[PDB]
C-alpha cells in the first residue's frame, strides 16, 4: 500500500502501459486485454491487470505533466517491482515532415523542466528511452506495416506556453513531437534502474494547425506487441 | 468545450475551490454544498457547481503537480470566466513550530520548478496569493476559533525528492508547508490576471515524522475556505 | 557597537522605519516623532529613536540597493534586537492601473538579484512580507481614507537597466511598483526570523512617463499607525 | 577549401569515421580501407578516403573536446556534403555493470558543457544519436558475436575534473562511458540536419581502477572499427 | 542635475577617487587635496573637487554594494563626463600569502552578483580594470617603496554570507581580497566606455582572524600619484 | 610519461609558448629558438625545447578549444613543472577601435563556456592573466615600437556560432578579440597556481569583414613571437 496507489505487491505485472487519461487505461483494459481486473482507484487514477496473448500486462493512468507522472512511475518501480514502463499518448507536431496520425517513438526526450537538472547536479542529462524497448516497438510496428518516426520528443511544463517561439527551435532541432511527460519518465527510470519508452500518435499539428480512434488503436497494438517481442 | 474540461461557459461559478483529488471534490460537493451537480468529468477530473449559504460556488480537482494544476486553472480562467481560485489540500511540514493538523495559508509559494522563470525572463518571480483572499481566509478562521499560520509554502516538482537536505533549508527560511502546486497556481493567476489562494492542512511532519483527526481537520479547512468566499464578497 | 552602526543595544526600538535616504530618516524623526534623538551616524547613515503617540519607534536610512540594505537590517536584527522593519520609499510604476502618488504595499517582492538564490540552493524563494504587518498597514490606510495597492514589488539590481524590455514583462505579471531593496529585506527577515514590510509611494510612471511631499507624508503616517495597530 | 580542412568538394565520402587522434585515422585508413588516399592535413589533422567492400568511406581525426570536434564535423557537413558521421574512440567506465574492453554505443550523450544550452534557449536538449545508425551498429556487433552496451555517454569538458564526485552521479544514472565529444557531435548533427553516432571501447574503469594492456586494447579497438564499417553497409540497406 | 547627484556638468574633474564612505571622501578632500569644495550632498553622499599637485581631482562616496556604486559611477560617467574612476577601500583577505595592511590592486573582480550576467547574455564577463590604470598604480606604489599585490578581487553581494565555504574556494583560486563593489564598477566602466580601477588595503584576515589610518594614507597617496602618472 | 604528452620530466623549460597549431610550434622552434629538439608528438601535437639568448624555452601546440587546451596546459603544469605559459595565436576583432594586424593582449578572458562556473561554485570567475606577464609583454612591444591593445578576450565554445548577435554585445563591452582558449588557460592557471598570458594577432575583423594577406599575417605573427620571447627575459629580471 502506497500513498497514491491502493494496491498490493504482485497486483501489477512487471510491464505497465500508461496513457495519461485513466479512462484511456479503462478503455485499453476492456478492449485489448483479456480478463482485466481493476487494481487501483485512488484519486480516480484507474489501473488494471489482465493478459495479452497469455502475457500478464498492466495498464494505468499517470495524469498530466512530469510531477504527476513521476509520482506514479516512481511508486510502480520501487513499491510494485515494475521493470518496464511504456507511456502511450497524443502529441503535437512542430516539423513539416511529420503529419497528424503519424506514430512517433521518443528515443530521447528534451524538456524545459528542471527535474533532470536537480538529479544531475545542474548539468545536461540526456533523458533517453531503453534501447531494447525502442527496437521492440519499431519491430512491432514494421510487422503490422505501420511506419514510425524515432527521435526526440519535447516534454513541456506548460501546456499553454508563454513562449511560442520555442516551437520554431524544436522544429529546427528535429523534435518529432511535443508531449508533457516523457523527459520525466526517462529521468525516473534512470534514477531507479528501470526501463521506459514513450510512444505517441500525432493528434495535432502545432505549426500547420492540422481516424483518431483507429490510429490510437494502432499505437496500442504496437506497444502491446512490443512487450511480447521484448520478452524474447 | 475546452480540451480538458467538458463543460459550458456558465457551468462554473466565478469562485472555485480546488483540491488535487477529484474524489475530494466529490466529497466537498456532497457534504458542504447544497444541490451540487457535476459539471465536468474528462479524465475523471470531477468538477461540481452548487451553493454555499445561497452563494453559487464550484469545486473541482486539479490533479497533481504544477503542470496539471496550470492546465485546469488556466482553462477555468480563460474559458469559464473564473475569477477566484482557492486551492485546498494537505501538506507536509518541515518546521518544528508547526504541528500536524495545523491549518496554513500560503501568502507566497516557493518552488524548485522552472515555470515562473520561463514566464519572467529567468529572474525571481515572487509567486504570491491575492491579499484580500488571504485576509478573508484569515478572518474566516478567526471567526471559527481556528488558528492559521500565514507564510510561505514550498511547491515541489519531485514528491520523491533526490535532495532531502533541501527540507532543512526550507525550515531555516520559515516555509510553513510543502506541497506541489501553489507556485504554479499563483503564477497562472498573475499571468491571466486572476486571484488565487492556497490553504492547506498539515497531514505529515517531514522532519519529526509525525484518519479521523485528519478528516476532522480537513473539514475545518473546507469551512474556512467557503466562509472566506462570503467574507470576500462583502 | 557593530561595524556599520555605532549605537548600543537598547538604542533602537523593536520596530524600525527605514527610508533609503538618511536625510529622509532625519525628516521623519523631526516631523513625525516626538523627542527623537540621533542614535547612529557611521557613513552618514543617520538613525534616530523617538516616540509616536507614546510608542517608542526608530527610523534609520538603509542606503541604496540590496547589499546595502541587507547589511543594515541584518545588524539591526542580530545585534540591536529589532523585531519589525518597515521600509518606506518611492517607487516607479509599470502598470497602467497605478498612478503617480498611489501608495503600494509589497506583499511579495520579485528581483533580478541572486541573493535569495544563494540562500535557497538556486531555487525560487518567494520573498514576502509578514502577513500581520501587511494587514496592519492596509488597516491603517483604510482608517485614513487612503486606497493602497497590495501586490508584488520588483527589486532591481541595476537602476540604469541594460534591459528596459523587462518593464513590459513586470507589467504583464502585475508588478505594482519597481524599487531596489524589498527582496533583500524580505530575504534577510526570513534568514534571521524577523518581520518586515515595504510600503512605497509611486513617484514616477516608467511606462507613461508621468504633491510628492504630501503623498510621502501620507505613507509615513500609514506606517506609523500600522505599528500601533500591529501592537494590539 | 575551408579554414580547418584543406580538401575539395568530393574528397570525402558521405559517411566519415572519426577517432580523436589523427594517427588512429591513419591506422584505420591503412589497415581497414582499400586504396586510401590522404585528403587533408591542416594542423596535422589527417583525413583519408578509401573504400570498404567497394563502398566509399572517409576517416578523419577530430581533435579532443567538444569545440574541436564541432569545428570539424560542422565543416564536413556544411562544406563537404557529409551525411553520416561515426565517432569511434575510447571512454572510461563508471558503472560496475560495464567492464574494461566493453563496446558501448551512445544512444544519448549527457554533458557538463553549455553548447546545447546555447543552441536550445537554455532548456534541456537530449543530445541523441540517429536511431537507424544505432540499430545498424547494434546488429553488426551482434552478427560478429560482440555484445554492446547501448546507453548514455557523458561528454566531459574537463578531463582533469575539479569535481570527481560527479562520477558517482553518472554511475547512479546509468552512464555507460565517459568521453569528451559525443554531446557536441550530437548537437551539431541536430543543428545541421545530419546523422551521427558515437561508438566507444572501454579502456579504463574510473570507479574500480581497472586497466587493460595495450594488446587487448588494440584488439578491442579492431573490433569496434569492423562493427562501424559493417554498420555503414547495413545502414545503406 | 541628476536624481542622485545634485551637481552641474563641470563640477567634477575627469577623474574621481571613490571610497565607499562619504566621511572618508570628506577626510580625503580636506587632508590630501588643495582647496576642495563640496559639489554634492544628496542622501549625504558627499562629493568634492579640489586639486592634487595642481591636477584637478574629485573624491566622492559611492555607498555600499554593487547596486549603490553602479548608480553613482553610471551618473558620473554619462552625466558629468568622468573618464576614470579609482575606488579605494578596505577589503578582507582569505589567502595566507596576504597579510593585514597589505595593499592589493584588483586587476580583475570575481563576483556572486548577477549584474554582469544580465549585461552579457548570461555568459562569463571577466570584469577587469583598465590596464594603464593598474600599471600607473603599481608604478606609483613602487616610487614610494610600497609593495602591492595585483590580482583578482571578489565582489560579494552579501556581507553576512550564508555560505562561508566560498572563502576556501576564493583562496584556492588566488583571490587577493574580498570587497563588495569592484565587479560592479568594472561592469559599468565597460558598458559606458570608461576606465576603472579598485585599490584596497587589507583591514582584516577572514581566514586567520587577524596602523590602519597610516596604511589608509598609503593607499590614498598611491591612488592620487597614479592619477598624475596616468596623465603622462 | 603522461597520457597526452610523451616526454620526461625536464624535457620542457619552466616557460612554454603555445600556439593552437602544432605546425606553428614547429615553425617557431625552428625559426626563433636555437638548438630546438622535439620532445613530444603524441597525437601529432608537437612540443619542442630550444634556447632564446641562452634562456631555455619550450614551444608546444595545444589543439583547438578550451577542453583540448586545458588537458595540455594541465599536464605541463602538474607533470612537467611548467610555471609560466604564454599562448600565442590569431583572433578575430569585433570592435571598430581594433584593426586587422593589431596585437592584442588578454588581461582578462570572457567566455560562454561552463568550465570556470564548474570550478567556482557557479559564480562569476574573472579569468585573468598574470599581471607581471602582461606588463613584460606590454613593455616588450613598446620597446619594439609595437602598440598593443590590452583588454578582454572572448573565448568561444562554438567557432560556428548559432548566435551571431553575441558579437554586437562583445563590441559594446570592449572585447579586444575573439578566440577559443584563453578563458580556459586562465582557469587552469588559477586552479593549479601557475601563471599565464594570452597574446593574439588580429587576422580578421568579424564586424567589418576586413581580411589580411598571408604575407602581412606572417609578419604580424613574427612580431608577436618576438614580443613573447622578449617578455620572457624581461619577466626573469
Swiss-Prot record, chain B:
Keyword field contains Protease: no
Entry GO CC: cytosol
GO MF assignments: purine-nucleoside phosphorylase activity
UniProt site positions, description: Important for catalytic activity: 214
Protein family (similarity comment): Belongs to the PNP/UDP phosphorylase family.
Catalytic activity: a purine D-ribonucleoside + phosphate = a purine nucleobase + alpha-D-ribose 1-phosphate; a purine 2'-deoxy-D-ribonucleoside + phosphate = a purine nucleobase + 2-deoxy-alpha-D-ribose 1-phosphate
Active site residues according to the UniProt entry: 204 (proton donor)
SUPFAM superfamilies: Purine and uridine phosphorylases (SSF53167)
Function: Catalyzes the reversible phosphorolytic breakdown of the N-glycosidic bond in the beta-(deoxy)ribonucleoside molecules, with the formation of the corresponding free purine bases and pentose-1-phosphate.
Positions annotated to bind phosphate: 20, 24, 43, 87-90
Subunit architecture: Homohexamer; trimer of homodimers.
Family annotation (PROSITE patterns): PNP_UDP_1
CDD domains, per the entry: PNP_EcPNPI-like (cd09006)
Keywords noted in UniProt: Glycosyltransferase, Transferase
Protein name, UniProt field: Purine nucleoside phosphorylase DeoD-type 1
Gene that this polypeptide is encoded by: deoD1
Catalytic activity, EC: 2.4.2.1
Organism of this sequence: Vibrio cholerae serotype O1 (strain ATCC 39315 / El Tor Inaba N16961)
Residues noted as binding a purine D-ribonucleoside in the record, renumbered to the chain: 4, 179-181, 203-204
GO biological process, one term: purine nucleoside catabolic process
PANTHER family membership: PURINE NUCLEOSIDE PHOSPHORYLASE DEOD-TYPE (PTHR43691:SF2), URIDINE PHOSPHORYLASE (PTHR43691)
